[PDB]
Amino acid sequence: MQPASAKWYDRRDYVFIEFCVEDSKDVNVNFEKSKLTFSCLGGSDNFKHLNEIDLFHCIDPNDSKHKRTDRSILCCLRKGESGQSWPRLTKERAKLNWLSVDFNNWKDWEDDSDEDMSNFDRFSEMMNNMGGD
Amino acid sequence: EEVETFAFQAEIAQLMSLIINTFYSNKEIFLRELISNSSDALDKIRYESLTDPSKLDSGKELHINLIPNKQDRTLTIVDTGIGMTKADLINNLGTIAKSGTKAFMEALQAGADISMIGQFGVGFYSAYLVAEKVTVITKHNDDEQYAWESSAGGSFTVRTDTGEPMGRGTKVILHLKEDQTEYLEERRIKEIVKKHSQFIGYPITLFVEKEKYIDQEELNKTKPIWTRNPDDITNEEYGEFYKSLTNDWEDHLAVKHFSVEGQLEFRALLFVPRRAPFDLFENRKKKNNIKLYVRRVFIMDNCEELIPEYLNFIRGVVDSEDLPLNISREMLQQSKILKVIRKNLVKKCLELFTELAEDKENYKKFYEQFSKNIKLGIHEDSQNRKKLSELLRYYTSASGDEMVSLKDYCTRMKENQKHIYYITGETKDQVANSAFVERLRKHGLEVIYMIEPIDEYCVQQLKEFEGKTLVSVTKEGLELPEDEEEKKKQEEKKTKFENLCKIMKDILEKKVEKVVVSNRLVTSPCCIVTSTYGWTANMERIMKAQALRDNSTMGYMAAKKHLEINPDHSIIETLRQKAEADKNDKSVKDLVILLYETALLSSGFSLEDPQTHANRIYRMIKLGLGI
Amino acid sequence: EEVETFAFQAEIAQLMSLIINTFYSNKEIFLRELISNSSDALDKIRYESLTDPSKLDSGKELHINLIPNKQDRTLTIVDTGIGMTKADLINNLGTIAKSGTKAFMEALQAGADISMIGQFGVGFYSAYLVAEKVTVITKHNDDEQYAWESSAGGSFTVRTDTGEPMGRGTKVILHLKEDQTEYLEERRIKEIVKKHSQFIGYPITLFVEKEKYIDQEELNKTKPIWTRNPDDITNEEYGEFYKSLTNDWEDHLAVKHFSVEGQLEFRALLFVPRRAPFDLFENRKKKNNIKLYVRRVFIMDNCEELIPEYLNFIRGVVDSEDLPLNISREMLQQSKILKVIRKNLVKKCLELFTELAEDKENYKKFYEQFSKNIKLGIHEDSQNRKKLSELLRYYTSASGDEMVSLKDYCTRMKENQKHIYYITGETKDQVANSAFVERLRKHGLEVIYMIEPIDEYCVQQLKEFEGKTLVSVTKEGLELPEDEEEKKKQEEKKTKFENLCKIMKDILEKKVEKVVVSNRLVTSPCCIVTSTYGWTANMERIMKAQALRDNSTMGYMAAKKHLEINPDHSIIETLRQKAEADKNDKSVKDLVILLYETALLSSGFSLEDPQTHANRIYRMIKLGLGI
Amino acid sequence: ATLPQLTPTLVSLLEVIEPEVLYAGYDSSVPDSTWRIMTTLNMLGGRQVIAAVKWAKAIPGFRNLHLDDQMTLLQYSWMSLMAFALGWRSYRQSSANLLCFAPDLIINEQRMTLPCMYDQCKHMLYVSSELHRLQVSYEEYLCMKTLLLLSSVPKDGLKSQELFDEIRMTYIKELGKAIVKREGNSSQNWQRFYQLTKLLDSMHEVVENLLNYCFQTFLDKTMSIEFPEMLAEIITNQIPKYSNGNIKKLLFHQK
Ligand SMILES: Nc1ncnc2c1ncn2[C@@H]1O[C@H](COP(=O)(O)OP(=O)(O)OP(=O)(O)O)[C@@H](O)[C@H]1O
Ligand SMILES: Nc1ncnc2c1ncn2[C@@H]1O[C@H](COP(=O)(O)OP(=O)(O)OP(=O)(O)O)[C@@H](O)[C@H]1O
Ligand SMILES: C[C@@H]1C[C@H]2[C@@H]3CCC4=CC(=O)C=C[C@]4(C)[C@@]3(F)[C@@H](O)C[C@]2(C)[C@@]1(O)C(=O)CO
Ligand SMILES: [Mg+2]
Ligand SMILES: [Mg+2]
């Protein structure tokens, strides 16, 4: 078997992993508190894929889910601790050749700097947030 | 219902055209594409040889050759890298978006220390930006030597080669278009390589016919050193790197070497030069000197987004293993990335300056060249004002010729000082001998001298330091620690001179906002100070000379002038007596105007209609001479 | 030998991924692209209906609708254009880089007046930057209604549709990704359409539910008018276009509408606003309000390449039918083109300014707002310097309150004037009443008054006007159209005052270069002029206040001072007599210094240590008062 | 040579522009009377408004508005601006219990016996108290004052409406800068924003009550309350617009 390539990014509450298998079959996703296992048959050659990810920080497997589309399989993991920083996806620091950051959906979400406050749309959100103070 | 399913297709003819005509804007980049492919080929063979040394039996030297030929318009590039088998030659050069490099990396076992350039699959074809035809000769350890050939006409051919054996490797021959022949010039080749591909791990040699013999010049002599652990690099090594990077002759003054880990990762080297260049802020077109590289290939340089202008004197390199590059590989898709890099670069520069500041002699050298950049940063960077202010140095009334920090000032404050006092002006001597500090000096209070035009913008944003407010000694309302007896005496003086304050105001009309009795003068009869907010005399004269200014606003914005009287001066006392005796005495009127104008000049204000002033002086002279 | 021939292939999966992930840096463009496709569809049906009107029996309106749906989290774009047959859905959407628009154009007989937007064949797939599934419903006059569907998984499907008939047209439904819902907002859609597609020729209507109906709003209400023959456009029409484009509440001051034909073609509209914007110079991010469009689609703005900085107040549009664009359609290939466009825009701007200047009082209005821009242009633009100089207007000693041209000055010159006299300074009156022009006025010679700081830069480039050089009245030596008798008298005076001059020079060691007898003063005693090179008193004053300046050159360009004596002044004669009687008489030393210092105030210099000057005065006052 | 530029901030320009405090010219030997006091204040108010006009004209970007819009904005908000000026002066010399109309005209509770000062002053004092509670800085003050000028527009819009909104945004950003420089957590900068913003919205209420009173004394000639002509003209022209609901109040916070 071989790992599927994948991309990832996160947000304050969730971690997102996209397994880039087109025309996937028999997709099996196992969400455990400290581990994610992906298993998939797929592509034109029915190649068997396997990705065992020992996670950086624990998640809530009961608020985790995935959606299969013809283009890719997207997994959404719930962070065990909201606001937790995830500098890397895995527990170990070795680079995995098949894993990369999904820069197109990357956001520096952990950034509350005093950018122009308005920015009306950003502003309105912040006024609605301050409205709850 | 019935639903038909189809696979996606592509039109090869148009696809080939788009690659050639719409993907790349700079024709010369074809050279870096070919060089990059070569460095990958070399890494592949090097990697394999790690577990199987027989892989290099076919040749052990890993290098790149460039051989222009003006006698037959071609340019040949030669590798000793892994090469291609017939099957690979067909699938990889044969398929528009196929990347063998990408597949190889995916196949590799982690954590092999391999970093290759080449995830798109499209780039070989950039050869046709300048070439009419391309011929590729290859030899792989597991196969026969073969020749591939194409004019990008929708087809290509493969034949078994008959030429000299290469052992292992590739040869790429570009048959150039007749109108793209500058690429055969030694000068042009050197410029291209130096700009885009000098930090490549394999040596690149340029072969040039001269009078005959062929010269052989290595181009990439400098190694990237930023890839090394910072603790293993000596200053001499940093210095040599610096010099070849910047074409200096002088060494560097200071350097940081650091890395950032996380979802977005990078390494960087930042150098502070020993002399400010001479064009800072005047060049206008050139903004920063930080170059950005990805897996040591140059991507961009004159990017405003990486560094705030106030740090436009830092020379340096940023190198990242993984960034979201554009198809042309000349820019990034996500501008949000630059913002992060910038936050980190600024933070580290400030750490460097702080560290540098511990070395008093080197700091002095630094400050003398870049104090304007610090002050500018205070004006513009609201996030770091707190830290930047500790890097400031000023001459003070108690420092002689040393420049001292604000903390140093603070350590000498008297117990009853609540304020840090300062004066601004044109020169050190104009301020030092100014009337405005006569009492402060008498009482032993230290005053900071700020004498650069930029200081007006800077001090405006400081307001306080470590809880002590800053006070301008040229503004109204100056307060000194004071005794009770002195305060009582001042009130008596204010009372007895009330009549001059009124009379003088009536004489001056709109030339002054008010006339008051001074508490800051000792020997000068009077001075002019400004209101608490906004402009001071120096800000005013500066604004008036900025040339690209809105003239219509200068009709509203002006310093508000207040005249202060020294109650103990002999001129003032005889004036009081005369003025009370006769409110309309011509002598009084003329003296008041003369004192006003004199004060106005000594207080730093431009005098309107100086000819009138001069004429008064001339009359005094004529009188003295008996004319 | 045996040579095998092969065709090029893809790697559709990778190709699809590059289009989606690497080609486009922004996302908003997905709307830009889908609208452009509808525009082409509409032009195609319109075109065909010209020879066969029955083609519109299926519908007469040609328009585009945008319908967001927040319950479905979809966005639908509805066209009424030509549609697609089953065969076209498969061939045009199922093939990457296939382009129906391109083929259509190739099949047309020239010069059909149709110009479509589209060549590459990949823009459709930009849909997947924000989708999720994409569903396309089409109806062509020659076929059944069909539904195409794909999620870009390597395949797509086609089925005969079963839902509501469209008559004729295309419906594109984008399902959106969960976090792309911002594109369903009314505000966001309007911003995008206005930015990129406001000049699409077919009306675009946005359908938004509001409290309990759908609000139907047309967005592209303003037609491009630059496509019309200039002679058919009234000023009122230009006015409305202008206001719509800039949001001004008032009409333009002037407009130039022109076109360029040749290997490079374009049309353009350049407008001159009635008021300079505030922050014209000060906004450092927005420069050059010239937008570039290609075939009515916005490509770029705020590009430093299109026009010089000094013309940044001009608002306008450049629209070109065939420029070579980048695959992203965000930038132009062959950037050298922009230099040609720039050359043409500048000469036409100058043409407009000249026309305004030729006969309107409106020129005064123009100049009042933009004279700074002209002067700046003189400083930086050498090629057009002669033209620019004729647009200048100045106050002069003979103009009262009018500003006049250099040609007017020339008209009034005396037959013996070989020079144009001018003075620079701080204010109109400070200059007009200056000692430096006393004799020129006596002789009836006109002097130009230059009182803006920018003028000091302008005059460093202007050396002559129509062969007559410019001379500053504050320089080292003037040629005046004197009589021969006057010349010998001047020599007699130089002789009798030679002893005084050497005495004064010793008193003033290192304050002056020399002391000489004046030929420019009438009633004023001495004054100070500067050496031919370098800086004038006013230039020095200005340079010292620029803040971001290199202080090391202040001791270099400072220039030198010369003191000039009025031989007929009564102070000077008294002084000569005393000075010759006793060279070391203290009262002479004191008088000489006072005159020197006074001369520096009349001439535009600051005093160093002005406190000393003040003290000299205070002593004179005390003597006068009997203290 | 080259011409690199460095510009001042808007706030500093506002510091320069801001007018001086005027004296009432009140003769302190004159005994209190409700109408003597109100007349003195109306005459002062006249002078202050004249200055306000001069002030507004100097505000960067204001001058490029259609002239008719400039006049409209000044009349619609003149009362708001005066309430802030009063706030500031009282706050800065607080004395939470006194109103500082002018030097000399410092009014305490025992002087504040006019039936309107025994009522409407609750609003005038409110503004002072809020500035106090929030410890408002001078720079914040100036920024807010400027925004009050832009808080009320005709319901039918301005002739130069697009520019109006651009200008408004400029000053909004400046406020934020004045807040941010106070340092602290980003959430604190947002709280402070929020709170100051709430204060501005609350002044519409303050003004409404004060105007209702103003109109009543203006029109009711029974009382010996005099007005300078300029204010009388402004008041006359605003009463019918005010009363018809032709004026739109802009809020930062909807509720
Ligand atoms: N000199 C060479 N030696 C061995 N293999 C080569 C050489 N040049 C090209 N190749 C092969 O051809 C493939 C295509 O290379 P090309 O430069 O077109 O794309 P790339 O490097 O994969 O993409 P990119 O545009 O990102 O650089 C490579 O992946 C590699 O397998
Ligand atoms: N709304 C539509 N109505 C009719 N035909 C369409 C529509 N949208 C797309 N097409 C067809 O699909 C083809 C592909 O369009 P696409 O937008 O991908 O490329 P393009 O416009 O040709 O290229 P470019 O990237 O240069 O805009 C078109 O050439 C056209 O024939
Ligand atoms: C209650 C109202 C509100 C008052 C005003 C509130 C704002 C203000 C602040 C000052 O610093 C000077 C005058 C004014 C501008 C003002 F104090 C007076 O004009 C009188 C005034 C209109 C009022 O007292 C009357 O209605 C009297 O007729
Ligand atoms: Mg390559
Ligand atoms: Mg298209």
* Rounded Cα distance, D237 and D214, in Å: 13
* Rounded Cα distance, D175 and D180, in Å: 9
All domains of chain A in start order, with CATH: 6-131 (2.60.40.790)
* Rounded Cα distance, D106 and C431, in Å: 49
Closest CA to C416 of C376, C468, C366, C378: C468
CB D237 within 8 A of CB D110: no
Beta-carbon contacts of residue D2 (< 8 Å; ≥ 6 apart): B282, B284
In what side-by-side order are the strands of the sheet with B74-79? Answer: B213-218, B204-210, B64-69, B74-79, B169-176, B131-139, B146-150, B155-160, C4-7
For residues B72-83, one letter each, b for 16 or more C-beta atoms within 10 angstroms of the residue's C-beta and e for the rest, the string is ebbbbbbbbbbb
Atom of ligand 3 nearest to the CA of D101: 11
For residues C324-355, one letter each, b for 16 or more C-beta atoms within 10 angstroms of the residue's C-beta and e for the rest, the string is ebbbbbeebbeeebbeebbebbbebbbebbee
Beta-carbon contacts of residue B382 (< 8 Å; ≥ 6 apart): B461, D177, D180, D181
Sequential DSSP letters for C250-279: S--SEEEEEEE-SSS-EEEEEEE-SSPPTT
Sequential DSSP letters for B329-385: SSSBS-THHHHHHHHHHHHHHHHHHHHHTTSHHHHHHHHHHHHHHHHHHHHH-SSSH
Sequential DSSP letters for C222-252: SPP-TTS-GGG--HHHHHHHHHHHH--SS--
- Distance (angstroms) between ligand 5 centre and the Cα of C99 equals 8
Q: How far apart are the first and last CA of chain D?
A: 57
* Rounded Cα distance, A69 and A74, in Å: 8
Closest CA to C65 of C218, C197, C261, C253: C218
Residue C107 burial (CB count, 10 A) = 7
Separation in Å, CA of B271 to nearest CA in chain A: 28
Q: Where are the alpha helices (DSSP H) in B23-85?
A: 30-49
Closest CA to A48 of A56, A57, A39: A39
CB C252 within 8 A of CB C245: no
Give partners of C (≥3 CB pairs < 8 A).
A, B, D
- The shortest CB-CB distance from C278 to any of D4, D60, D66 is to D60
Beta bridge partners of C68: C75
Backbone angles phi, psi at D13, to 5 degrees: -70, -35
Domain ranges in chain C are 1-221, 222-383, 384-627
Q: Residues B101, B106, B107, B112: is their CA dihedral positive or negative? A: positive
* Rounded Cα distance, D89 and D136, in Å: 12
At B150 the three-state DSSP class reads strand
Sequential DSSP letters for A50-92: EEEEEBSS-EEEEEEEEEE-SS-EEEEEEESSTT---SSSBSS
CB C244 within 8 A of CB C104: no
Q: Where are the alpha helices (DSSP H) in B382-443?
A: 385-388, 406-411, 428-432, 438-442
CB C481 within 8 A of CB C414: yes
| Burial category of C588 from C-beta neighbours within 10 Å (exposed 0-12, middle 13-18, buried 19 and up) | buried
A97: DSSP letter: T
Q: Does the annotation flag C79 for ligand binding?
A: yes
- The shortest CB-CB distance from C457 to any of D1, D66, D162 is to D1
What is the maximum alpha-carbon separation in chain C? 122
At B572 the three-state DSSP class reads helix
For residues A65-74, one letter each, b for 16 or more C-beta atoms within 10 angstroms of the residue's C-beta and e for the rest, the string is ebebeebbbb
* Rounded Cα distance, D23 and B562, in Å: 17
CB B438 within 8 A of CB B523: yes
Record: contact D15-B546, CB cut-off 8 A: no
For residue D76, is it left (φ>0), alpha (ψ between -120 and 50) or beta? alpha
Domain ranges in chain D are 10-249
Sequential DSSP letters for C115-172: --S--SS-GGGGGGGT-S-EEEEEE-TTS--EEEEE-SSSEEEEEE--S---SSEEEE
* Rounded Cα distance, D92 and D81, in Å: 17
Both tokens assigned to D39: 């007349």
* Rounded Cα distance, B233 and B257, in Å: 10
* Rounded Cα distance, C433 and B522, in Å: 37
Kind plus residue range of the DSSP H or E element containing C448 = strand C447-450
* Rounded Cα distance, C84 and C161, in Å: 13
Distance (Å) of CA B575 to CA A40, B590, C617: 102, 11, 16
* Rounded Cα distance, C604 and C430, in Å: 10
Pocket lining: D217 vs ligand 3, CB cutoff 6 Å: yes
Tracing tokens 């001047």 back to the chain, one arrives at C490
Contacts with B336 from chain A: Cβ below 8 Å? 106-108
Q: Residues C100, C103, C107, C108: is their CA dihedral positive or negative? A: positive
* Rounded Cα distance, C461 and C444, in Å: 27
Atom of ligand 1 nearest to the CA of B169: 3
CB C500 within 8 A of CB C576: yes
Closest CA to B373 of B305, B471, B307, B302: B307
Backbone angles phi, psi at B156, to 5 degrees: -150, 160
Going by DSSP bridges, is the β-strand pair A6-10/A99-101 parallel, antiparallel, or unpaired? Answer: parallel
* Rounded Cα distance, A35 and A32, in Å: 5
CB B118 within 8 A of CB B102: yes
Separation in Å, CA of D63 to nearest CA in chain A: 24
* Resolution reading in Å: 2.6
Distance (Å) of CA C245 to CA C199, C259, C298: 11, 20, 13
CB D82 within 8 A of CB D159: no
Contacts 24+ apart (CB under 8 A), B229-237: B230/B257, B230/B258, B233/B257
Among the bound ligands, name the one nearest to the CA of residue C92: 2
Distance (Å) of CA C435 to CA B611, C397, C423, C445, C569: 8, 14, 11, 15, 13
Residue type (1 letter), B543? M
Per CATH, the number for D10-249 is: 1.10.565.10
Q: How far apart are the first and last CA of chain B?
A: 120
Q: Express the helix, strand and coil content of chain A in percent, nearest 5 each.
A: 10, 45, 45
Backbone angles phi, psi at C563, to 5 degrees: -100, 130
Reduced 3-state DSSP string for C182-229: HHHCHHHHHHHHHHHHCCCCCCEEEEEEECCEEEEEECCCCCCCCCCC
Residue type (1 letter), B186? E
Both tokens assigned to C93: 């959407």
CB C80 within 8 A of CB C168: yes
Pocket lining: C42 vs ligand 2, CB cutoff 6 Å: no
- Best residue for ligand 3 mutational test, from D39, D82, D121, D145 (most atoms within 8 Å of Cβ): D82
- Distance (angstroms) between ligand 2 centre and the Cα of C120 equals 9
Beta-carbon contacts of residue B391 (< 8 Å; ≥ 6 apart): B353, B354, B357, B367, B374
Beta-carbon contacts of residue D152 (< 8 Å; ≥ 6 apart): D73, D76, D77, D80, D204, D247, D248, D249, D250
Closest CA to B385 of B465, B306, B450, B308: B465
* Rounded Cα distance, B76 and C497, in Å: 84
- Best residue for ligand 3 mutational test, from D21, D22, D23, D42 (most atoms within 8 Å of Cβ): D42
Record: contact A104-B340, CB cut-off 8 A: no
Residue type (1 letter), D55? W
Beta-carbon contacts of residue C540 (< 8 Å; ≥ 6 apart): C557, C558, C559, C605
At B270 the three-state DSSP class reads strand
- The shortest CB-CB distance from C153 to any of A23, A104, A105 is to A23
Tracing tokens 């203006």 back to the chain, one arrives at D218
Closest alpha carbon within chain D to B535 = D16
Q: How far apart are the first and last CA of chain C?
A: 121
Beta strands in C295-357 (DSSP E): 297-300, 315-320
Cα C225–chain centre separation? 22
Beta strands in chain D (DSSP E): 99-100, 106-107, 152-154, 247-249
* Rounded Cα distance, C407 and C388, in Å: 13
* Rounded Cα distance, C186 and D179, in Å: 32
Both tokens assigned to B362: 């080197």
Residue type (1 letter), D191? Q
* Rounded Cα distance, C448 and B222, in Å: 60
CB A87 within 8 A of CB A107: no
Beta bridge partners of C66: C77, C206
Separation in Å, CA of C247 to nearest CA in chain D: 6
Going by DSSP bridges, is the β-strand pair B419-424/B468-472 parallel, antiparallel, or unpaired? Answer: parallel
Backbone angles phi, psi at D182, to 5 degrees: -75, -10
CB C513 within 8 A of CB C560: yes
Closest CA to B590 of B609, B564, B617, B608: B617
